[PDB]
Short mmCIF file of all heavy atoms in Angstrom, two decimals:
data_model
loop_
_atom_site.label_atom_id
_atom_site.label_comp_id
_atom_site.label_asym_id
_atom_site.label_seq_id
_atom_site.Cartn_x
_atom_site.Cartn_y
_atom_site.Cartn_z
N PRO A 65 32.35 -10.86 -0.65
CA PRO A 65 31.34 -11.86 -1.05
C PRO A 65 30.78 -12.71 0.08
O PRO A 65 29.57 -12.98 0.09
CB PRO A 65 32.11 -12.72 -2.06
CG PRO A 65 33.09 -11.78 -2.66
CD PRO A 65 33.49 -10.81 -1.59
N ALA A 67 30.30 -11.90 3.11
CA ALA A 67 29.56 -11.06 4.05
C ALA A 67 28.16 -10.77 3.52
O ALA A 67 27.94 -10.69 2.30
CB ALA A 67 30.28 -9.74 4.28
N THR A 72 20.00 -3.83 2.20
CA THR A 72 19.26 -4.92 1.56
C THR A 72 18.97 -4.64 0.09
O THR A 72 18.55 -5.56 -0.62
CB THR A 72 17.93 -5.20 2.29
OG1 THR A 72 17.09 -4.03 2.23
CG2 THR A 72 18.19 -5.60 3.74
N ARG A 144 12.68 -1.28 6.77
CA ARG A 144 13.29 -2.61 6.73
C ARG A 144 14.72 -2.58 7.25
O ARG A 144 15.11 -3.40 8.09
CB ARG A 144 13.24 -3.15 5.31
CG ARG A 144 13.53 -4.65 5.24
CD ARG A 144 14.82 -4.90 4.55
NE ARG A 144 14.98 -6.25 4.00
CZ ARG A 144 14.53 -6.68 2.82
NH1 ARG A 144 13.85 -5.88 2.01
NH2 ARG A 144 14.78 -7.92 2.42
N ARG A 148 16.59 -4.13 10.56
CA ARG A 148 17.65 -5.11 10.42
C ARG A 148 18.85 -4.73 11.28
O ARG A 148 19.46 -5.59 11.92
CB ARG A 148 18.04 -5.26 8.95
CG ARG A 148 19.25 -6.15 8.70
CD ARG A 148 19.24 -6.62 7.26
NE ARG A 148 20.37 -7.46 6.91
CZ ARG A 148 21.50 -7.01 6.37
NH1 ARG A 148 21.66 -5.71 6.15
NH2 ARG A 148 22.47 -7.86 6.06
N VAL A 156 10.06 -5.18 15.72
CA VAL A 156 8.91 -4.41 15.23
C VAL A 156 7.65 -4.91 15.92
O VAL A 156 7.30 -6.09 15.83
CB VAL A 156 8.76 -4.51 13.70
CG1 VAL A 156 7.59 -3.64 13.25
CG2 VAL A 156 10.03 -4.09 13.00
N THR A 166 -1.06 11.72 -4.84
CA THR A 166 0.00 11.27 -5.74
C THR A 166 0.47 12.54 -6.45
O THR A 166 -0.20 13.05 -7.37
CB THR A 166 -0.52 10.19 -6.69
OG1 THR A 166 -0.91 9.03 -5.93
CG2 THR A 166 0.57 9.80 -7.69
N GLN A 174 -4.05 21.63 -4.12
CA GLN A 174 -5.34 20.94 -4.10
C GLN A 174 -5.47 20.14 -2.82
O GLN A 174 -4.60 19.32 -2.50
CB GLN A 174 -5.48 20.03 -5.32
CG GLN A 174 -6.82 19.35 -5.42
CD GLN A 174 -7.06 18.79 -6.80
OE1 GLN A 174 -7.25 17.58 -6.98
NE2 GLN A 174 -7.05 19.67 -7.81
N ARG A 177 -8.64 14.33 -0.69
CA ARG A 177 -9.88 13.78 -0.15
C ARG A 177 -9.57 12.51 0.62
O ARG A 177 -8.75 11.69 0.19
CB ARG A 177 -10.88 13.50 -1.28
CG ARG A 177 -11.35 14.78 -1.97
CD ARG A 177 -12.36 14.52 -3.07
NE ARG A 177 -12.81 15.77 -3.68
CZ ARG A 177 -13.96 16.37 -3.42
NH1 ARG A 177 -14.82 15.83 -2.56
NH2 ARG A 177 -14.28 17.51 -4.02
N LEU A 179 -10.95 8.82 2.34
CA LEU A 179 -11.70 7.76 1.70
C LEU A 179 -13.21 7.86 1.92
O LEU A 179 -13.94 7.00 1.43
CB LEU A 179 -11.20 6.41 2.19
CG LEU A 179 -9.80 6.11 1.68
CD1 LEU A 179 -9.30 4.82 2.28
CD2 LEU A 179 -9.84 6.05 0.15
N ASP A 231 -21.32 4.40 2.50
CA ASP A 231 -21.70 4.58 1.10
C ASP A 231 -23.20 4.41 0.87
O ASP A 231 -23.70 4.83 -0.18
CB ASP A 231 -20.91 3.61 0.24
CG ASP A 231 -19.42 3.97 0.14
OD1 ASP A 231 -19.07 5.13 0.41
OD2 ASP A 231 -18.61 3.10 -0.24
N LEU A 235 -26.62 11.50 0.33
CA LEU A 235 -25.67 12.60 0.22
C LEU A 235 -25.89 13.63 1.32
O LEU A 235 -24.93 14.24 1.80
CB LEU A 235 -25.77 13.26 -1.15
CG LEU A 235 -25.08 14.63 -1.22
CD1 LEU A 235 -23.56 14.45 -1.11
CD2 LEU A 235 -25.46 15.39 -2.49
N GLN A 236 -27.14 13.83 1.74
CA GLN A 236 -27.44 14.84 2.75
C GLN A 236 -27.03 14.40 4.15
O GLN A 236 -26.61 15.25 4.95
CB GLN A 236 -28.92 15.21 2.73
CG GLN A 236 -29.24 16.43 3.60
CD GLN A 236 -28.36 17.65 3.27
OE1 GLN A 236 -28.17 17.99 2.09
NE2 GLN A 236 -27.84 18.31 4.30
N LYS A 246 -20.00 18.08 0.03
CA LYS A 246 -19.07 17.08 -0.47
C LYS A 246 -18.30 17.58 -1.68
O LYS A 246 -17.08 17.39 -1.76
CB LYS A 246 -19.83 15.79 -0.81
CG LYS A 246 -18.92 14.59 -1.03
CD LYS A 246 -19.62 13.25 -0.77
CE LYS A 246 -18.61 12.10 -0.81
NZ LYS A 246 -19.24 10.75 -0.81
N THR A 296 -9.24 -6.77 2.53
CA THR A 296 -10.62 -6.99 2.93
C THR A 296 -10.64 -8.01 4.05
O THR A 296 -9.86 -8.97 4.03
CB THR A 296 -11.48 -7.46 1.77
OG1 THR A 296 -10.73 -8.39 0.98
CG2 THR A 296 -11.89 -6.27 0.89
N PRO B 66 -30.62 15.17 -2.74
CA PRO B 66 -30.04 15.10 -1.39
C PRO B 66 -30.40 13.81 -0.64
O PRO B 66 -29.56 13.28 0.10
CB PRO B 66 -30.62 16.34 -0.69
CG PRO B 66 -31.13 17.23 -1.82
CD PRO B 66 -31.55 16.30 -2.90
N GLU B 67 -31.60 13.27 -0.85
CA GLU B 67 -32.05 12.13 -0.07
C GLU B 67 -31.52 10.80 -0.58
O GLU B 67 -31.74 9.78 0.07
CB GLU B 67 -33.58 12.08 -0.04
CG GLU B 67 -34.24 12.04 -1.42
CD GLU B 67 -34.50 13.43 -2.02
OE1 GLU B 67 -33.96 14.43 -1.49
OE2 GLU B 67 -35.26 13.50 -3.01
N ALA B 68 -30.80 10.77 -1.71
CA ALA B 68 -30.31 9.49 -2.21
C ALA B 68 -28.79 9.40 -2.09
O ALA B 68 -28.08 10.41 -2.21
CB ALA B 68 -30.69 9.27 -3.68
N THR B 73 -18.70 7.05 -5.12
CA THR B 73 -18.38 7.29 -3.71
C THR B 73 -17.52 8.53 -3.49
O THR B 73 -17.38 8.97 -2.35
CB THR B 73 -17.68 6.07 -3.10
OG1 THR B 73 -16.48 5.81 -3.83
CG2 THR B 73 -18.58 4.84 -3.17
N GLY B 78 -11.47 14.97 -8.88
CA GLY B 78 -10.33 15.84 -9.09
C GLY B 78 -9.02 15.14 -9.35
O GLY B 78 -7.98 15.81 -9.45
N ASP B 136 -1.83 5.81 -9.16
CA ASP B 136 -2.34 6.36 -7.93
C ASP B 136 -3.13 5.28 -7.20
O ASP B 136 -4.09 4.74 -7.77
CB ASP B 136 -3.22 7.57 -8.25
CG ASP B 136 -3.74 8.29 -7.01
OD1 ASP B 136 -4.06 7.61 -6.01
OD2 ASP B 136 -3.83 9.54 -7.04
N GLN B 138 -5.21 5.56 -4.71
CA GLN B 138 -6.59 5.98 -4.43
C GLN B 138 -7.48 5.72 -5.64
O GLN B 138 -8.65 5.34 -5.49
CB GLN B 138 -6.62 7.46 -4.06
CG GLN B 138 -7.93 7.91 -3.44
CD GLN B 138 -7.71 8.92 -2.33
OE1 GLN B 138 -6.66 8.93 -1.67
NE2 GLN B 138 -8.70 9.81 -2.13
N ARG B 145 -13.78 -0.51 -5.06
CA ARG B 145 -14.89 -0.17 -4.18
C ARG B 145 -16.17 0.10 -4.96
O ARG B 145 -17.25 -0.39 -4.59
CB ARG B 145 -14.49 1.05 -3.35
CG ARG B 145 -15.58 1.66 -2.48
CD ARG B 145 -14.96 2.84 -1.80
NE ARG B 145 -15.84 3.58 -0.92
CZ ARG B 145 -15.44 4.67 -0.28
NH1 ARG B 145 -14.20 5.09 -0.46
NH2 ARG B 145 -16.25 5.33 0.52
N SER B 160 -8.78 -10.02 -1.34
CA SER B 160 -8.13 -9.02 -2.17
C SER B 160 -6.68 -8.85 -1.75
O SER B 160 -6.26 -9.28 -0.67
CB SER B 160 -8.91 -7.67 -2.14
OG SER B 160 -8.93 -7.09 -0.84
N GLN B 175 13.71 1.62 -16.78
CA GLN B 175 14.41 0.94 -15.69
C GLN B 175 13.65 -0.29 -15.20
O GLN B 175 12.42 -0.29 -15.10
CB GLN B 175 14.60 1.92 -14.54
CG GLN B 175 15.52 1.43 -13.43
CD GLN B 175 16.26 2.57 -12.76
OE1 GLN B 175 15.77 3.18 -11.79
NE2 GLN B 175 17.44 2.88 -13.28
N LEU B 180 11.56 -7.08 -3.25
CA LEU B 180 12.01 -6.86 -1.89
C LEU B 180 13.22 -7.70 -1.50
O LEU B 180 13.77 -7.49 -0.42
CB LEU B 180 10.87 -7.14 -0.92
CG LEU B 180 9.79 -6.07 -0.94
CD1 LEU B 180 8.71 -6.45 0.04
CD2 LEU B 180 10.39 -4.70 -0.61
N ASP B 232 18.06 -12.04 4.64
CA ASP B 232 18.89 -10.90 4.98
C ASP B 232 20.17 -11.30 5.72
O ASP B 232 21.10 -10.49 5.80
CB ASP B 232 18.06 -9.91 5.80
CG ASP B 232 17.22 -9.01 4.92
OD1 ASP B 232 17.27 -9.18 3.68
OD2 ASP B 232 16.49 -8.13 5.46
N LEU B 236 26.35 -12.09 0.36
CA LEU B 236 26.13 -11.57 -0.99
C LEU B 236 26.34 -12.65 -2.05
O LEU B 236 25.56 -12.75 -3.00
CB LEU B 236 27.02 -10.37 -1.26
CG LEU B 236 26.89 -9.73 -2.64
CD1 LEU B 236 25.54 -9.09 -2.86
CD2 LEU B 236 27.99 -8.70 -2.87
N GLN B 237 27.39 -13.47 -1.91
CA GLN B 237 27.61 -14.53 -2.89
C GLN B 237 26.46 -15.52 -2.88
O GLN B 237 26.00 -15.96 -3.94
CB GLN B 237 28.93 -15.28 -2.64
CG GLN B 237 29.26 -16.30 -3.75
CD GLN B 237 29.56 -15.62 -5.11
OE1 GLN B 237 30.60 -14.97 -5.28
NE2 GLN B 237 28.64 -15.78 -6.08
N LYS B 247 23.75 -8.76 -7.95
CA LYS B 247 22.74 -7.91 -7.34
C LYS B 247 22.79 -6.48 -7.89
O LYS B 247 21.74 -5.91 -8.21
CB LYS B 247 22.90 -7.94 -5.82
CG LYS B 247 21.63 -7.60 -5.10
CD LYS B 247 21.73 -7.78 -3.61
CE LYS B 247 20.37 -7.52 -2.97
NZ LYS B 247 20.29 -7.98 -1.56
N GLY B 301 7.69 -9.98 15.68
CA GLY B 301 8.70 -8.95 15.69
C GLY B 301 9.30 -8.60 14.35
O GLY B 301 10.27 -7.85 14.31
#
Side-chain angles (χ1 to χ4, degrees):
Chain A
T72 62
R144 194 247 201 84
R148 174 160 179 266
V156 183
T166 297
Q174 184 164 120
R177 294 181 179 258
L179 290 176
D231 290 340
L235 165 69
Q236 189 53 46
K246 194 155 188 190
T296 40
Chain B
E67 57 272 14
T73 59
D136 184 322
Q138 194 142 332
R145 174 181 179 182
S160 64
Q175 190 149 88
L180 287 179
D232 277 1
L236 180 66
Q237 186 67 70
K247 204 173 185 166

